[PDB]
Amino acid sequence: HMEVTEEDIAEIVSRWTGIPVSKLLEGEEKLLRLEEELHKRVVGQDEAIRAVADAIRRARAGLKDPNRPIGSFLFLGPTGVGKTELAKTLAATLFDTEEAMIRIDMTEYMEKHAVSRLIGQLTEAVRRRPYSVILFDEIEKAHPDVFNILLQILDDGRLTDSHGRTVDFRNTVIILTSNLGSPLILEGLQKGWPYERIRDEVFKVLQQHFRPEFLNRLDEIVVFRPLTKEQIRQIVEIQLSYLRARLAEKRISLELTEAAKDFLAERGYDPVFGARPLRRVIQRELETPLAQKILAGEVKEGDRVQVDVGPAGLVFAVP
């Protein structure tokens, strides 16, 4: 039908039921091309994306335990290389909006009485949103008791609160994240440890916090890799999207050189936080002098701006 769209109908069903549009429109095939959706935003990390996609494909084919969340993942490796981005993108694609991602920072869940806070910070959030990606950040800091409740989610896709009434988790996607090993790998490189030492050290620290009985309940254990220079160069480009869209209103083009992107990349990426400090770097190195250039009148309506590297920082040109 022409005047009435698929979206029009889907929205009605979506609003009456509470089922996301995406979920109603999953079949109209996208599951086949879900890796490319996630690639629009998550540069690199091809293994992590396939994992997540393969897990979701299995649940959608009716091949997994129905009494479980759709997917359960442990995302290991360094921070700032795509974990949160992926989690968000995952929510936006499967459940329409990033607002459909619940983030539990386990730093607040270390001192025993933290279970009650969950059961109901967690249980209430998943009560009003049955269709949600749940992001447990740095899960290794979490207290044992708080870890026990997480297993209950992994066992039957449900969880009891204070009243006794169970909250359904069978439509949720659980992503757990941790750095464990990475800071340690950084230690041994700065301390000149032999490879096998570092490798032995990481393994035992992982064994301490995550015991087989818990990992067995997970769909995939993903280890995120550090980014290559080329991957970072694409991360720079993506991060510019908003600025470039802001300038585009006044028909202003922002055209960086090869050296320019590397410059930002160098200072906006480090092995500790990955690419997380890049935003502030862009804002300081490029967005600052550009603002000055505009307000000085040296950059105008429709102007094409060429960004190059220099000795002082970034140099700007008008052709």
Author numbering: 518 to 545, 547 to 637, 650 to 849
Pull text from the paper.
We determined high-resolution X-ray structures in different nucleotide states for one of the motor subunits, namely NBD2, of ClpB and combined the structural analysis with nucleotide-binding kinetics studies.
Structures were determined by molecular replacement to resolutions of 2.8 Å (nucleotide-free), 2.4 Å (ADP) and 1.9 Å (AMPPCP). Most importantly, our structures of the nucleotide-free and AMPPCP-bound states are of significantly higher resolution than those available previously, allowing a more detailed structural analysis. This single phosphate ion forms a salt bridge (d = 3.0 Å) with the positively charged side chain of the sensor 2 residue Arg806, which is not observed in the nucleotide-bound states, in which Arg806 is involved in a crystal contact with Glu520 of a neighbouring molecule. Apart from this, the structures of the different nucleotide states are highly similar. Strikingly, in all ClpB NBD2 structures determined to date the side chain of the Walker A lysine Lys601, which is crucial for nucleotide binding and hydrolysis, is present in a completely stretched conformation that prevents the expected interaction with the β/γ-phosphates of the bound nucleotide.
